[PDB]
Amino acid sequence: NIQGITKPAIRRLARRGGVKRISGLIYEETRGVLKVFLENVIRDAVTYTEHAKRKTVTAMDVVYALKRQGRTLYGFGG
Amino acid sequence: KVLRDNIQGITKPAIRRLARRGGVKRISGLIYEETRGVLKVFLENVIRDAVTYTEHAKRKTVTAMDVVYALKRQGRTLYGFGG
Amino acid sequence: AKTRSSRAGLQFPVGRVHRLLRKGNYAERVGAGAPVYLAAVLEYLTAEILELAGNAARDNKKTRIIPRHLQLAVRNDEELNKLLGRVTIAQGGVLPNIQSVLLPK
Amino acid sequence: TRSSRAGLQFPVGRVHRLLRKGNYAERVGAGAPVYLAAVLEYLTAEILELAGNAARDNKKTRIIPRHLQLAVRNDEELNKLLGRVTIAQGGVLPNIQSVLLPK
Amino acid sequence: TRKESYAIYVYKVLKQVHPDTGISSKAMSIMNSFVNDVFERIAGEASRLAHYNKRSTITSREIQTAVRLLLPGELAKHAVSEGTKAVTKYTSA
Amino acid sequence: KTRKESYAIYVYKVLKQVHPDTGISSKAMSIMNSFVNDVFERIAGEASRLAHYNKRSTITSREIQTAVRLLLPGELAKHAVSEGTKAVTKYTSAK
Amino acid sequence: PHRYRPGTVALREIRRYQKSTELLIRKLPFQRLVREIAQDFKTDLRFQSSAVMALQEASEAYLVALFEDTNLCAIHAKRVTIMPKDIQLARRIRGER
Amino acid sequence: HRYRPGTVALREIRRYQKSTELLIRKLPFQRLVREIAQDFKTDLRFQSSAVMALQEASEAYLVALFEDTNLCAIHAKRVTIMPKDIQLARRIRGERA
DNA sequence: ATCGATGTATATATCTGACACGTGCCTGGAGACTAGGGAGTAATCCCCTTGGCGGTTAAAACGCGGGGGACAGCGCGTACGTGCGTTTAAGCGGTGCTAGAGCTGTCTACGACCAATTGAGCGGCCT
DNA sequence: AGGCCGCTCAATTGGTCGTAGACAGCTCTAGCACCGCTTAAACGCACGTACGCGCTGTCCCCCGCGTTTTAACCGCCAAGGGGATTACTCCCTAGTCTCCAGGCACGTGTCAGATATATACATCGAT
């Protein structure tokens, strides 16, 4: 469930961003945007996996799906 | 002939018309210099790539496809001048 | 039915698309079904855009299509706008809208 | 080998094979792999020396991804080049806005 | 010399869609640019997909997956259906 | 087993060339491999596109030079061009 | 005499210029500016007319989009007047140096 | 003693801009990833490095979004971020229409 | 709030410059055939993913008290919008000239294919 | 992770052949420059008013601290699915020659829409 992304985790993520004081309604908005981003990336990765006739989602599928959206990621056998 | 300080040929009413097409209702008096600086940076960024494409072909005239390719390079595709 | 397009029931050229795929440096070999599939997709997209453009032109009591109608058709449809979100159309203009707070009260 | 002739550390032969097999053009000229390998070696040497300086600045003996991230972000040209790239385990640079600073 | 274009095919499709409508020169230029752009995008994805799996051939399966990656939902579904119908018609006859 | 290829040994040589008494971990080496591959694909793709635009069927060092000029920023591009030309002329002179 | 209150002619102009599709900048000054910029790169360059026309199209579209973002930023801060800081915030968020 | 509000916040700001660790718990994130993926193809297996890559990308994206949101909040003369700031940042960046 | 000033979409002539139909012809696509190698198919091995058990303990959840910050309201003064008269130079329509993009012919030097050889680099274990 | 052992497979060397392109010539389109003219648009000025900005008060809702709880992380054990590799063969695509028709360049007729302009209607603003 999306509720496993607790409030203190979101506060830590905000504190890395430099945010000093947080409203009470930020948490639902953050959960929504995170869910949307994950759906897009996972859909692309599953398409890449299913083309290769596999049943396991590898790291290279995620790397290709991220590179597709202009979010190149280094460190995972690129 | 030598050309100097032609950025001011982009007059104030032209800026105001561009703003009105964008939905702006009220404009401050310091907007015009900012807009001119932004436009100069954009043109300097595109014309450099266009002239590089021109120079690679050992050609002395800049054509439309050079500009189209340059715009493609900064992710700013343009339709209507060749493909 | 000599041409491949007539066999496949399309309007776009299968042979030209095959030639471009071969002399475009995409792969060592090109299969026999790729040109047909790609031509069908391209024809579908072209017809989809032209339908909306013609409707927009008829809205303004005009017979011919100009770039304004293409711009309106693309920007009024959600998925066509999503596909072509980073594309500029010459002489297209902008979509007419005004923010609420600027309106008279 | 063709690397010793040009005085390089990167493999000219491997780059030639990759260009030939990589589906870029019908034919590949003779001097392209040498030029490309020299450019790659220069770029990696620059990155490595900046990262090593950052590592020594932190009083460490080996380079970790944090040092690479700091080196890339502190150099303006390399930050412009690798602007849409995320380095895993790289973190962020410490900066707090002026208005947020305590009075 | 000879300059290739898609003008005749675009006109045929338009006459099928709106039998009593014309098109300007600038609009047809925009149509040519659009067709070229979409062709290039799909072909590039097909090439990358073939290279990732270590294959030397671009088949209709690569084209289908490239279309499925690029086009949004309903548009992609309709495009896939049209392509499959065309390939079936070609193979049967 | 699978015989993967990497630039680990050449990166290590360059590192010991510029930093003798320094080591590097596996994560940083993998990041370096990813960076090298990224830049290689960028340069090669731009060069192939340039060759295709001008109706040439070959990739020479002129295309590589122009692609480097297009992709890298100013001073970095100037230094990279200098190094590449020096290497090319050294290779040509030797035999 | 007769005088419209401020804000009416502005809305009328907004409607007028969103209705049309013409270019908004004069042609000769833009051509002269383009040639002046290009002098700094290679000497004795020639331009096709369609090249200058494409440059003008692209520049105008870019400026209109920037002004839309600037208006959004101005409305965010409970204002109606656009100011340079709005342009700066828009360009910083969009990722432009 | 009792800390005046706003200094502890700066303390964890300094603490968390100094480290490189992951901030989200791993098991809840993995369960969320599998639950989302069930909608596209049932009975899917995941490599562990795939889930780690997804977590890295998600954390980077959220941190960048929060930076832009804080910038927007400062623009409107506030100190607290609000949902409207997130909406404005996402609209300028081009994600939300 | 009727009414006066000003802006706006409309009906129509006209007049044109561009849309669309025709014809010749050449260059590229359709048809038949052969020959080799990419990949589709089936088997085998073992790596790595999924599942379950119990511990300690780190972190999330709850509640309360208090102050810092967001927000509405008030008042002032500066900077922007509107309208009018004057100055400027952009746009139009010709002319003439010539530089350079573009096509043709050839012949020269350069890259691909292939046979044989070797040592450079990837795999695996150590300190 | 730095270093060393093993070896095997990709890099080195050399020769032949076919052709991509470098160079030279020549034709001709289109870019550049000049002249005058009309008027459309930019410049400058003055006034008024509406909105940007500072200040103040209130109330609320975020933060920090302490207690209880709950489930994440860790270590160990069991089992099997499916990813990676290997061998065989077959059928699908490339390359070649022949021939022919679809599409491109040039030519031309005529008609849908851009101007000029008078007008009913919408809309805004002062007394």
B57 vs G: CB within 8 A: no
Q: Is D63 helix (H, G, I), strand (E, B) or coil?
A: strand
Phi then psi for residue D62, to 5 deg, are -130, 155
Helix B31-56 vs helix G27-39: crossing angle, to nearest 10: 60
The residue type at B72: K
> For the purposes of burial, counting CB atoms within 10 Å of the CB of C39, is it exposed (0-12), middle (13-18) or buried (19 or more)?
buried
DSSP symbols for G37-68: HHHTTSSS-EE-HHHHHHHHHHHHHHHHHHHH
How far apart are the C-alpha atoms of D66 and B17, rounded to whole Å?
49
Q: A67 to chain D: nearest residue by CA?
A: D85
- Which residues make beta-bridge pairs with B79? C89
Pick the CATH number of F7-93 from 3.40.930.10, 1.10.20.10, 3.40.190.10, 1.10.3720.10: 1.10.20.10
In a domain, A46, yes or no: yes
In a domain, B2, yes or no: no
Phi then psi for residue E51, to 5 deg, are -70, -35
Domain ranges of chain H: 1-97
How far: A41 CA to I105 C1' (Å)?
57
Phi then psi for residue C89, to 5 deg, are -110, 125
Q: How many residues does chain F have?
A: 95
DSSP symbols for chain B: ------GGGS-HHHHHHHHHHTT--EE-TTHHHHHHHHHHHHHHHHHHHHHHHHHHTT-SEE-HHHHHHHHHHTT-EEESS--
- Chain J bases closer than 7 A to any CB of the protein: 1-2, 9-13, 20-21, 30-33, 41-43, 48-53, 61-65, 71-73, 81-85, 92-94, 101-105, 112-113, 124-126
Structural domain total, chain B = 1
How far apart are the C-alpha atoms of H97 and H92, rounded to whole Å?
9
Structure determination method: cryo-EM
> For the purposes of burial, counting CB atoms within 10 Å of the CB of C92, is it exposed (0-12), middle (13-18) or buried (19 or more)?
buried
Nearby residues of C2 by Cβ (< 8 Å), 6 or more positions away: none
Pick the CATH number of H1-97 from 3.30.70.2190, 3.30.360.10, 1.10.20.10, 3.10.450.230: 1.10.20.10
Q: Which CATH number describes the domain made up of G48-97?
A: 1.10.20.10
Tokens found for residue A55: 């049943």
CB-closest option in B21, B25, B79 to C88? B79
How far apart are the C-alpha atoms of A73 and A67, rounded to whole Å?
7
Q: Which domain holds residue A13?
A: 2-68
Q: Contact, A60 vs F4, CB < 8 A?
A: no
Domain ranges of chain F: 7-93
> For the purposes of burial, counting CB atoms within 10 Å of the CB of E44, is it exposed (0-12), middle (13-18) or buried (19 or more)?
middle
Tokens found for residue G92: 């910083």
Q: Contact, H55 vs H26, CB < 8 A?
A: yes
Q: Is H5 helix (H, G, I), strand (E, B) or coil?
A: coil
How far apart are the C-alpha atoms of H86 and H68, rounded to whole Å?
8
Q: What is the CATH number of the domain that holds B13?
A: 1.10.20.10
Q: At G70, which helix (H) or strand (E)?
A: helix G49-76
Q: Which residue has the tokens 């290779």?
A: F91
Tokens found for residue C51: 């339908």
What ranges in A4-78 are assigned the alpha helix state H? 7-16, 26-51, 59-68
Q: Contact, G72 vs H88, CB < 8 A?
A: yes
Within 49-78 of C, beta carbons closer than 8 Å to E belong to: 49-51, 53-54, 57-58, 63-67, 69-70
Phi then psi for residue A48, to 5 deg, are -60, -40
CATH topology for the E1-93 domain: Histone, subunit A (1.10.20)
Longest dimension (CA), chain F: 50
Nearby residues of A51 by Cβ (< 8 Å), 6 or more positions away: E49, E53, E61, E65
Q: For residue D96, which of B77, C40, A17 has the smallest C-alpha distance? A: A17
Q: First CA to last CA across chain F, in angstroms?
A: 38
Q: Contact, A19 vs A7, CB < 8 A?
A: no
How far apart are the C-alpha atoms of E59 and E63, rounded to whole Å?
7
- Are residues F54 and B52, on separate chains, in Cβ contact within 8 Å? no
The CA R_g of chain D, rounded to the nearest whole Å, is 19
Residue C19 C-beta-side C-alpha neighbours within 13 Å: 5
DSSP symbols for F34-85: HHHHHHHHHHHHHHHHHHHHTT--EE-HHHHHHHHHHHS-HHHHHHHHHHHH
Domains of chain C, each with CATH number or no CATH:
1-105 (1.10.20.10)
Please state, as a whole number, how many other Cβ atoms lie within 10 Å of the Cβ of residue C80: 18
How far apart are the C-alpha atoms of G66 and B35, rounded to whole Å?
10
